[PDB]
Amino acid sequence: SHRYDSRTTTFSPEGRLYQVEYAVEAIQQAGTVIGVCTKDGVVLAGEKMVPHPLFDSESMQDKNTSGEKMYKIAEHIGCSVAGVTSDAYALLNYARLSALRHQYTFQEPMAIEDLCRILCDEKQLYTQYGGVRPYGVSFLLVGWDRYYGYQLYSTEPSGDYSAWSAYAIGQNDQVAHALLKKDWHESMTLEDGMLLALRVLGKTMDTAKIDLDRVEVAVMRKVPASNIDQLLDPFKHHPKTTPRFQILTRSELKPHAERADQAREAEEKAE
Amino acid sequence: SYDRAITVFSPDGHLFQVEYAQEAVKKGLAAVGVLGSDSVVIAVEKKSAVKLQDSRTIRKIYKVDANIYLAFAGLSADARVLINKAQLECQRFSLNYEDTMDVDMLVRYVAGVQQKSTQSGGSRPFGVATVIGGFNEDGKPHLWKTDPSGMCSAWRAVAIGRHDQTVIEYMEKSYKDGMSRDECVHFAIKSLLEVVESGSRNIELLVLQYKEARYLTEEELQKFVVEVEKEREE
Amino acid sequence: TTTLAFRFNGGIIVAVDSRASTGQYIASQTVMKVLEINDYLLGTLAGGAADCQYWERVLGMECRLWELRNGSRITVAAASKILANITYAYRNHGLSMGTMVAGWDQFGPSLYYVDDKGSRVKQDLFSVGSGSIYAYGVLDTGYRKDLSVEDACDLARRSIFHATYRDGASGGIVTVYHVHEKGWTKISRDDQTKLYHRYFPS
Amino acid sequence: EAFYGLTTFSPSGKLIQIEYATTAAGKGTTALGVKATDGVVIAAKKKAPSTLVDASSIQKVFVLDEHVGCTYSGMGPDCRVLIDSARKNCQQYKLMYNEPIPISQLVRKISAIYQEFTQSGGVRPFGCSLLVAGVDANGYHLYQVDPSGTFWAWKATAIGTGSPDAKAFLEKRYTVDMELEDAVHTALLTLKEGFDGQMTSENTQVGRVVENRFEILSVDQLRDYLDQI
Amino acid sequence: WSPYQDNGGTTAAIAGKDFVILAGDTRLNGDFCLHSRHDQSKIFQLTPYTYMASNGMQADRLQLQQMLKYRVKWYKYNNGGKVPSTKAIAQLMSTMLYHRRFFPYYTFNMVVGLDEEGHGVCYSYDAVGSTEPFLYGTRGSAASFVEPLLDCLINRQHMTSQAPPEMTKEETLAMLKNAFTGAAERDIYTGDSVSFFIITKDGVQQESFELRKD
Amino acid sequence: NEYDSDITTWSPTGRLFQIEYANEAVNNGSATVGVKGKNFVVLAALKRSPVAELSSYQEKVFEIDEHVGMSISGLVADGRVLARYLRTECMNYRYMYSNGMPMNQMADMIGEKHQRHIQCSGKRPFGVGLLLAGYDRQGPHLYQTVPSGDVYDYKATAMGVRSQASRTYLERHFEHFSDCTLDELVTHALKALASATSEGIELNVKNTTIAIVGKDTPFTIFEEESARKYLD
Amino acid sequence: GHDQSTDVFSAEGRVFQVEYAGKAVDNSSTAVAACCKDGVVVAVEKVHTSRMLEKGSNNRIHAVDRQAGICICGLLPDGRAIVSRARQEAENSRDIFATPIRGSVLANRVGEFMHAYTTHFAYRPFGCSAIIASYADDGPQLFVSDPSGTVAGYYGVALGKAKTVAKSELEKLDFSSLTCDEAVGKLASILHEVHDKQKDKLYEVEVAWVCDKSDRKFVHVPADMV
Amino acid sequence: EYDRGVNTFSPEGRIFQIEYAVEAIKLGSTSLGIRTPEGVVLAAEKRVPSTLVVPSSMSKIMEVDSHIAAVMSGMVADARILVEHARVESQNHRFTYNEPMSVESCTLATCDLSIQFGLMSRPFGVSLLIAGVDEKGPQLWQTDPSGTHTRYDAQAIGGGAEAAQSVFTERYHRNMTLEEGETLAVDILKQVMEDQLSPENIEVAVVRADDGKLHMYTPTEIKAIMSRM
Numbered sequence A: 001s002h003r004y005d006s007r008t009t010t011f012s013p014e015g016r017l018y019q020v021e022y023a024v025e026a027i028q029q030a031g032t033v034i035g036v037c038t039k040d041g042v043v044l045a046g047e048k049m050v051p052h053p054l055f056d057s058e059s060m061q062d063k064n065t066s067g068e069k070m071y072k073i074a075e076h077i078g079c080s081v082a083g084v085t086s087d088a089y090a091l092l093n094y095a096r097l098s099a100l101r102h103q104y105t106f107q108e109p110m111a112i113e114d115l116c117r118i119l120c121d122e123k124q125l126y127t128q129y130g131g132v133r134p135y136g137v138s139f140l141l142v143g144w145d146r147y148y149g150y151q152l153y154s155t156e157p158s159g160d161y162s163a164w165s166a167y168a169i170g171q172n173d174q175v176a177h178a179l180l181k182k183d184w185h186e187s188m189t190l191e192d193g194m195l196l197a198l199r200v201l202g203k204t205m206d207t208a209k210i211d212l213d214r215v216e217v218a219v220m221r222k223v224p225a226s227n228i229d230q231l232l233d234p235f236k237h238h239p240k241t242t243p244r245f246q247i248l249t250r251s252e253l254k255p256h257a258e259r260a261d262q263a264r265e266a267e268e269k270a271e
Numbered sequence B: 001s002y003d004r005a006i007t008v009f010s011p012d013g014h015l016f017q018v019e020y021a022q023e024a025v026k027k028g029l030a031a032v033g034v035l036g037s038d039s040v041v042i043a044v045e046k047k048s049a050v051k052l053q054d055s056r057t058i059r060k061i062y063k064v065d066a067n068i069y070l071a072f073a074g075l076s077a078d079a080r081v082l083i084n085k086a087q088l089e090c091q092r093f094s095l096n097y098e099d100t101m102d103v104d105m106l107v108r109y110v111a112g113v114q115q116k117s118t119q120s121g122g123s124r125p126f127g128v129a130t131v132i133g134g135f136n137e138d139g140k141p142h143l144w145k146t147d148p149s150g151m152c153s154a155w156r157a158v159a160i161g162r163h164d165q166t167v168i169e170y171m172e173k174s175y176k177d178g179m180s181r182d183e184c185v186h187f188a189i190k191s192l193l194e195v196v197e198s199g200s201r202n203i204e205l206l207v208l209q210y211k212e213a214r215y216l217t218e219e220e221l222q223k224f225v226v227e228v229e230k231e232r233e234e
Numbered sequence C: 001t002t003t004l005a006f007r008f009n010g011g012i013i014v015a016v017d018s019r020a021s022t023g024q025y026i027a028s029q030t031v032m033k034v035l036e037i038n039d040y041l042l043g044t045l046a047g048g049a050a051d052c053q054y055w056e057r058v059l060g061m062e063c064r065l066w067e068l069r070n071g072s073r074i075t076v077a078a079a080s081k082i083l084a085n086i087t088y089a090y091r092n093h094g095l096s097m098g099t100m101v102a103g104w105d106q107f108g109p110s111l112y113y114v115d116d117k118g119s120r121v122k123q124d125l126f127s128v129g130s131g132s133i134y135a136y137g138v139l140d141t142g143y144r145k146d147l148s149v150e151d152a153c154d155l156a157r158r159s160i161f162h163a164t165y166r167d168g169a170s171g172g173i174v175t176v177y178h179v180h181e182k183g184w185t186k187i188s189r190d191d192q193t194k195l196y197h198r199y200f201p202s
Numbered sequence D: 001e002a003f004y005g006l007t008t009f010s011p012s013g014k015l016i017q018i019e020y021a022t023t024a025a026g027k028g029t030t031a032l033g034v035k036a037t038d039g040v041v042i043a044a045k046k047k048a049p050s051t052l053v054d055a056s057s058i059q060k061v062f063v064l065d066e067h068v069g070c071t072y073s074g075m076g077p078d079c080r081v082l083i084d085s086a087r088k089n090c091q092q093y094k095l096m097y098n099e100p101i102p103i104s105q106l107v108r109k110i111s112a113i114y115q116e117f118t119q120s121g122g123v124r125p126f127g128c129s130l131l132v133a134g135v136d137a138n139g140y141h142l143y144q145v146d147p148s149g150t151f152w153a154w155k156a157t158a159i160g161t162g163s164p165d166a167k168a169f170l171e172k173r174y175t176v177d178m179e180l181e182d183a184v185h186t187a188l189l190t191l192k193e194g195f196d197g198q199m200t201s202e203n204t205q206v207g208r209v210v211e212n213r214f215e216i217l218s219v220d221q222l223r224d225y226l227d228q229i
Numbered sequence E: 001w002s003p004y005q006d007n008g009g010t011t012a013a014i015a016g017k018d019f020v021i022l023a024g025d026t027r028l029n030g031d032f033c034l035h036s037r038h039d040q041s042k043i044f045q046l047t048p049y050t051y052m053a054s055n056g057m058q059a060d061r062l063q064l065q066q067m068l069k070y071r072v073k074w075y076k077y078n079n080g081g082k083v084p085s086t087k088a089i090a091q092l093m094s095t096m097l098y099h100r101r102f103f104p105y106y107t108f109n110m111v112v113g114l115d116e117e118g119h120g121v122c123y124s125y126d127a128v129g130s131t132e133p134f135l136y137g138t139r140g141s142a143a144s145f146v147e148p149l150l151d152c153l154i155n156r157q158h159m160t161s162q163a164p165p166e167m168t169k170e171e172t173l174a175m176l177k178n179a180f181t182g183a184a185e186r187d188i189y190t191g192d193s194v195s196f197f198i199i200t201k202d203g204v205q206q207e208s209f210e211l212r213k214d
Numbered sequence F: 001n002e003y004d005s006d007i008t009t010w011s012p013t014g015r016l017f018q019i020e021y022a023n024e025a026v027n028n029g030s031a032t033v034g035v036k037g038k039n040f041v042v043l044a045a046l047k048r049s050p051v052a053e054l055s056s057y058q059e060k061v062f063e064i065d066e067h068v069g070m071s072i073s074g075l076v077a078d079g080r081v082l083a084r085y086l087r088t089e090c091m092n093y094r095y096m097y098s099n100g101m102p103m104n105q106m107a108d109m110i111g112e113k114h115q116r117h118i119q120c121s122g123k124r125p126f127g128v129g130l131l132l133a134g135y136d137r138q139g140p141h142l143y144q145t146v147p148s149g150d151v152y153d154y155k156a157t158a159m160g161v162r163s164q165a166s167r168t169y170l171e172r173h174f175e176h177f178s179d180c181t182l183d184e185l186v187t188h189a190l191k192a193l194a195s196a197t198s199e200g201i202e203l204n205v206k207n208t209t210i211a212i213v214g215k216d217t218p219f220t221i222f223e224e225e226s227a228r229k230y231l232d
Numbered sequence G: 001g002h003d004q005s006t007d008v009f010s011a012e013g014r015v016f017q018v019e020y021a022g023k024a025v026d027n028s029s030t031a032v033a034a035c036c037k038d039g040v041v042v043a044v045e046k047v048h049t050s051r052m053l054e055k056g057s058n059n060r061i062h063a064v065d066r067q068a069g070i071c072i073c074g075l076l077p078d079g080r081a082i083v084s085r086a087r088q089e090a091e092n093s094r095d096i097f098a099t100p101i102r103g104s105v106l107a108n109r110v111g112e113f114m115h116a117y118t119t120h121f122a123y124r125p126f127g128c129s130a131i132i133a134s135y136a137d138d139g140p141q142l143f144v145s146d147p148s149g150t151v152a153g154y155y156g157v158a159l160g161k162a163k164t165v166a167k168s169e170l171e172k173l174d175f176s177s178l179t180c181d182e183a184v185g186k187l188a189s190i191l192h193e194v195h196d197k198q199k200d201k202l203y204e205v206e207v208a209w210v211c212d213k214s215d216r217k218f219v220h221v222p223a224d225m226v
Numbered sequence H: 001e002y003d004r005g006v007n008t009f010s011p012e013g014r015i016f017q018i019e020y021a022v023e024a025i026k027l028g029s030t031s032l033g034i035r036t037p038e039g040v041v042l043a044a045e046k047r048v049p050s051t052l053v054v055p056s057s058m059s060k061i062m063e064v065d066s067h068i069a070a071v072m073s074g075m076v077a078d079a080r081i082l083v084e085h086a087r088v089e090s091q092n093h094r095f096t097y098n099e100p101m102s103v104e105s106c107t108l109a110t111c112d113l114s115i116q117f118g119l120m121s122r123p124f125g126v127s128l129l130i131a132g133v134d135e136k137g138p139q140l141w142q143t144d145p146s147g148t149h150t151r152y153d154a155q156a157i158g159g160g161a162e163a164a165q166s167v168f169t170e171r172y173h174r175n176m177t178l179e180e181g182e183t184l185a186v187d188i189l190k191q192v193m194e195d196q197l198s199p200e201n202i203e204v205a206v207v208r209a210d211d212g213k214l215h216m217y218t219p220t221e222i223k224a225i226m227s228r229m
C-alpha cells in the first residue's frame, strides 16, 4: 500500500506544498465572491452558477441562514466560500460549532478573528499531518465584534488568512482586486459598498447589466435589537444594536443592481 | 493513524524534507533581530501595502509572553501554529513554576517542537524559521533563531528569510556591541534595507526594552528611513 | 515531629527534632528531617516520612534537571511550586506531608510551606508537626528580623527543645541548619536532653 | 490499515478520483424524479441481467423513513452503504426530536458521508448518485446527491445513463402547476423514452411522496399507471 | 477475605565495624496455628554483601524478594557485571515499596550489608519505604522487646560506667542470641529457631540456633 | 530486482530477499565459535583487536541467566534487543517455575520472536546471528539462530566473517568433543576461532572472549585472569 | 506491479504472491503422509547443510495436541508460526469446549489462519504447507493446508521437491488395507528413493504417527522402525 | 527516496537509513575524546556560521551529569534529544539507586532511544561521545545511529574523524597525562578545522579522575592550553 501513497503532506523541492498549490487552482475555478468592508456593514456579492430552469428552492423557513454562496456561521458571522463546495460544508459546520462553543464557554460572541484562526488551524492541520488532501476551500468571513467592528477576512487552503477592506476570491480574483483597489475608500456607506461590490462583480463576469439570477448578496450590518427580554435577566446588558447577517432576496437586491447598471452606463459616456 | 515516515535520510546524509522546509524559509519575507545594551530590536519586511488590507494595525511580530516576541519567516500558517504552541507553553510554564519563562527556555521548547516534527511519522517539518527576542526577569536581553531542523542559537544580530545570508554578511561587518536603543533601530533598518525595496510601508519594527515593548509608529519609523537611506548614498 | 524555619536578616534557620513515632512506640530517635535537596535548598519532612522522603527526592531530581536543562539553579519559588503541584495532583490520594522549602535564590532567602493538599504558602516563619503548637510559643516570643545568626539559631534550637520537652511525638536530637547566600550549613546537632541541662542547669 | 488519501488534487485543481466516481455514477440505469405541487415521484429502471433473476428482490427505490425515499444510480452496493446510513440518521433524528428528519437535514447528512469518502484516508469515493424525495414541514422535495457530496434541489431530474436526454425531455413536459397523477405519468413517460423494450411493473420501480408519506408503488398500483402510457 | 495476613516472627540485625549480623526466626504462623517451624523465607540474599529481611506477610516478602532479585539482575546487566552496593539496594527498595504506596506490600523490611568502606550497615523500612541507616535494627512481633534491649547494651545512654570496647562479631552474636532467646520466651509468635547470617567481606557464615518450641 | 525492497514480498522463485540480506549482516559480523562437549559448551568470540595502543570494547557475548548465555554476530543493536528479550523471558520463567528456562524451549522462543519480524510490513528481520549456549536437565545445548527465524541445534558451529574456515576446522574434530575435557573443548574452540583470523593476526586476551557454561558451572564470561590460562 | 502484494489480483484473478509462496514450498524438502484405518503416518526428509547438527535439529514435525500433529513443508520458521496457531486452537478447543479438537476442525482453523495472510497488503503469505494428522473423534485424518489457505483431506500426500515422484510411489499403496506399521516402512522407503544424493548430501528422515498403537497420541516413531 | 522503506536492508546487510544517518555525521563538525588515567577530555570544533553568533549557545558539549559529558557530531537538534534522555536517565538512576550512573549504563540508555525507528520516523543523525568517570575510572564511549555503543580510548567523529584517527594512531598512548591529552586534543582540532583555531572556535571539557567532576574550559583556560604548543 505504501507504493501508492501520494504523500500529500510532503514538501516539494522549492519548499512548495503541491497539494495546497493545487487546491488554490481549484478555488480560482470557482464562482467569484466579492467582499467589501465599509463602516456601516460588510457586503458579500457572489456569482451563483447558471440557474437551470428545473432547480428548486429548498424552501427553508429562515431565508437569511443560507443561500448558494453565503452562509451564516453565527448571529454575528457570515461567510462565503469558493472552491470544493462539500469541503466548505464540512468546515462551515466546524466553524458553527466553534463559534457556539465559544459562546458556551464565555457567553459572549466569538470575535471574528478568533473564529477565523480556528478555521484556518483546521485547514493548516491537513497540510502537515494526516496524509490526506487539504480542504479545497477559501472563505471570506465577515462579521462584527466589539473589538474591531466590521471585519472581513479571507482564508486559503494553506490555513493563512488575512484581513481586508475589500477582497475577492474565486474566478477572476486578480482582476477584481485591481478594480476594488481603484474604487474602495475608507468612508463608504453600505449602499456605496453594495454598489462597488456589484460593479466589480458585474465587471468580472463580463455582463452589461447585473444578472439577478446569477448573483447572491449578503450583508452583515447592525440593526436595532428587538427581543431585549429585560425582566428575564435584570442585570444583563443588552446592546441597542446587534449584528445581523442578511441574504438579499431578488427583490431587495433589484434596486441595488439597477443602481449599478446606471453607474456602468454613466462610465461608458466618458469613453 | 497515518504515520508514514516523511522525513528520511537520503544517501548523502541529507534530510530532504528539512532542506526543503529551509527552502520555504528562503522564500519568506526577511526579518532581522538586533541586540543592543538595553534593547532588542526585531524588524520584519511586510509584503507591501495594497490599499485593500485592513488599515487597522496587524502585527507581523508576535507576542509570545509579556517578555518575549517572535518574528518568523516561511509558511505563515505553520508559523501561526508554532506561535500558538509557544504561547501556550509559556503559560503552561508560569502555571507550573510561577516564574516567567526565560527566553532561552522558550526558544528551546520551540526548537524542540521543530526538531520533533522532522522525526515524527505522519508529519512534514514546519517550514518556519523564527527570531525570538526578549528579556529575562533579570534585565538581560536575548535574541535567538530557530531553523526548521530544530536548531537554535543565540545571536548578537540575525536575519532570516530571503537573502538572510546577504543581510548577515552585512551585519557581520558593521555591528558593534553596546549599541543604544536608537543605534539598534538604526542598525536594523539599515540591515533590512539591504534586501527590502523602500522603507516606506514595508517594514514593521518592534523595540524591546526590559519590561516595555513598543512598535514604531509609521511616522517615527520614517525619520529613521530618511536618516538611513541618506547614509546609504555614501 | 517538630520542625520550624524562619527568615531573618541573616538568612533562614531551619530546625528539627529526630523522633519518628509509630503512634506510641518510638521507631527511631534519629530520623533526619531536613532533606538537603540541592545545596541551596532544604526541605523538611513532617507527616508521612515516606511521602516526604519520596517527593522531596523527586523534587531534588526536578531541581537538578532544571539546572542541567537551563544552566542555572532553580528558584525557590519554582521548587516549591513543583512540589505543590505534585501534592495538588495527589490531593485525593491521602499523602501526609507538611514540608518546608527553604533556600536562597537570586531574589534572596525564601521560605515556603507546602502541604499534602497542594497548599503553598510563603511566610517568614513556620513551624510544622505535632509539636508546632509548642514551638510557636517559644518562637513567636523571641523572633525578630534583626537576630544575629547565633541568636537565631539559639531561638530555633530552644523552640525545638521546648517542643520536644512537652510533646510526646517529638524528641531526640535537635538539628539546626542555616541557609545563607552561599548555600546552607548544618549549624549543630544536640541531644534534646543535653539541651535540657544547658538551658535549665539546676 | 491504509491511511493515506486516495482522492487528491491534481495540477489543474481537479479531484480526479471524484470525477471518476462521478463517471461511475452516471453509468447506472436511469432514475428520475418529479416534484409536483402535492407530491414527488421517483422512478427507476430495474434492468435485470437475466429473466432468472427474481425481480421482486431487486430494489432500486428505497424507503429511508416513513416520509422519505430514495433511488440511485451507479454502483448499487455503494449506494446500499448510503441508504443504510441515511436510514440510521432518520431514526437517530426521530429519537432525538421525536419528529421526522426534514429532507434538507437528511441530504446534508448524506452529503457529509460522501464528502468524508473524498478526503478520509484509505477509501475511494462512492460511485453512486442518489435522488432523495420526501415531505417535511417545508413541503415536498427532491434532491440529487452526487459523489462530490454536492447536492441540488430539483423540480425534476434524472441520473444514470439516459440522463442528458431524459433531463431534456423533462424540461419540456414539466409545469409548475403539475399534480401528482400527471407527475407519475410524466416520470413513466420519460423512462419509456430511452427504455429498450417493453416497460412492465417488473422492470421498473416507482416511489411516490404523497400527503405525508413515501411509498413504493406495488406492482398492482404501478400496473394501473402503465396501462395509461 | 483479606489479601493480608501476618505470618509473624522477628528479624534483627546488628552492624559492626567490618561485619553485620542478621537474624530471623524461622516460625511461620497462620491463623491460630503454625505452618512451619523451619521457614527460611525471612532472609534473602540479594548480593554477596547485601541481604534483606522481612516480617509481615510471608507471601509478600516472597514477591518482594523476587522483584528485587530481578532489579538486581537488571542492574548487573546494565552495569557491566557489577553488583549494586548495599546503599544502592537500600534506596532501590525504598523506591519499590513506595511505588506500591497504594496497594502496599505488607512487609517490614531490612536491608543489611557492608558499605563501601567495608563497614556494616542496616536500613529498616516501614511498609512504604521510609528508611534510614542504623547500626542495629529489629522488625517484627518481638521488635518492641528486643529493640530497647539493644538500645541499652549497645548505646548505654543511661550508664555512668564508661562504654566498653567495640563489640566483636562473636560478642555481637552472643548478644543477639541472648535477645532472641528472651523474645522467644515472651512473644508467643516468635520461637523455634533463629537463622543467623554473619556478613563479612570474606563471605557469609550461617549459624542456626534453637529457641524454645512452645 | 523489483522484489528485494520489502520483507512482505516473495520473489517469483519463492525467495525472501530481505531475509537473505539480513543474513548478510550476520555473515559480516565478527567470527564466533561454539562447541559442545559432554558437560560443557564453549563460546569463543573474536572481538576487535587494538588499533596500535588504542582499544575498543563491544559487548558481543551476553549472559542471559545462570545457565545460558549467547554470542552475537551482525547488527549489535539487534543483539541487544534479543538479549533483552531473552533475559526477560528467562527471568519470567525462573520467577514462575523457580528453575531455569530449558534450552529447547528457549530456542523455540527466540525463533518465534524472529518470525514475528519477517512477515509484516514495517517490521524487519533481526540482522543478528546468535550462538546460544546453555545447560539444563537435558545436558548442554548449543543453538545457532539466524535472521530467517531458523534455529539449529549444533554440536559445534561458527558464524561471522571467515567463519567458513572455523567450520572446516570444526568438521575434522567435532566427533571427539563428546569425550573431550573442558580444557580441550576450549582449546578446540580457540583453534577454530583462530582459523578465522585475518592473515597474521593471532588470538590473545584482548581480541578474544571465551564463555563457558555447563554442569555445576553457571555461564561465565572469562576475564583477563582466567582467559590467559587458556590462550597460551 | 501486479505481483508485489498479496492484496492484489492479477488480471486473471490469480494472486501471485501466493503462487510465489507456493514455490517456496515446492523447492523445499519432501514430505509424505498416509492415512490408514488405524492412524496417520507422516514422514519428512530433513536436509541439513552442516555435518555437525544434533539429531533432532530443525524438527519439521510438531505435536499440536495429544492427538494431532503438524508436519511442515517449506520455510520452517513460518511453519512454527502455524504450529503455534494450531496449538492455540487445540488449547481453545480443550479449554472452552472441553473436547479435543476434531481434525477437520483443526485443519480448517489452520487454513483460515493461513488464508488470512493472503488478503491484506501488510502481511505476506506463509511459505509453508502444513500437513495435519489427527486422530480424534472424527477418526484418522490427514489434511494439507497450503499457503493459499486451501485445505484438503487426503489418503496420502506428498509435498516439496520430489512431490511428483513421491506421489507416483504413494499411488502404488493400497490405502484401504495399509496399516501404520507398514506405512512407516513404505513412507520412509519412499523418501529414500526420491531423495537426490548429489545435491543434498546430508539428510535424515523424520517420521511421526498418530495411531491406535501410540494410544492415539501423536509422536515421533522410535528410530528402530526406519 | 521513498522507493525503499526505512527498515530495509541493503544487499550487504546494512540498513540504508542507518548508513545514510552515518553519512550525515561526516558532514558534522569534528568532536573528539581522549581517555587518560587522570581523566577524559572532550573537544569540539564549534563551527559557528557567523561572528554574530553567541558561541556559548552552540554548545557541542553537554553536561549529562556532574560526572558525565557528551559531545555530539551531526545534527545538533537530534543530539539535544539524546542528551535530554541521557540526563533524564542519569537522574532516574540517582533517584532510584542513590548513586551516580555508570558511564556505560548511560550510553546504553542513550542507544536505547536510537533503536526506536519505523515511533521515530528516522534515526538520529548524531554520534555522541560520552566521557565520564565512575567506579571503573575514566571512560569514553561512542554512540552511533545504529544504536551501537563502543568503548574507546580515543575517538573522533565528524569531518575530521579520518585525519584525526591518523593522529591518534601515532601520538596516543594509554598512559598520558590530562595535560598531554588536552594538548593532543587541541592539536588535532588545529589540524582538521576549516577555520583558524582560536579560543572561542572550540569547546573543551574534561572529567577529572581525581574529583570525578566535569569542568568546561572557559576561553581563558583554552588559551592556557594553546599557550604550550
Ligand SMILES: O=C(NC1CC1)c1cccc(NC(=O)c2ccc(=O)n(Cc3ccccc3)n2)c1
Pocket (backbone or CB within 6 Å): C001, C046, C047, C048, C096, C097, C098, C099, C113, C115, C116, C119, C121, C126, C127, C128, C129, C130, C132
Ligand atoms: O505532622 C503531620 N502529621 C502527623 C502524622 C505526623 C503533618 C502533616 C501535614 C501537614 C502538617 N502541618 C502542620 O502540622 C502545620 C502546623 C502548623 C503550621 O503552622 N503549619 C504550617 C502551615 C502554614 C500555612 C498553612 C497551614 C500550615 N503546618 C503536619
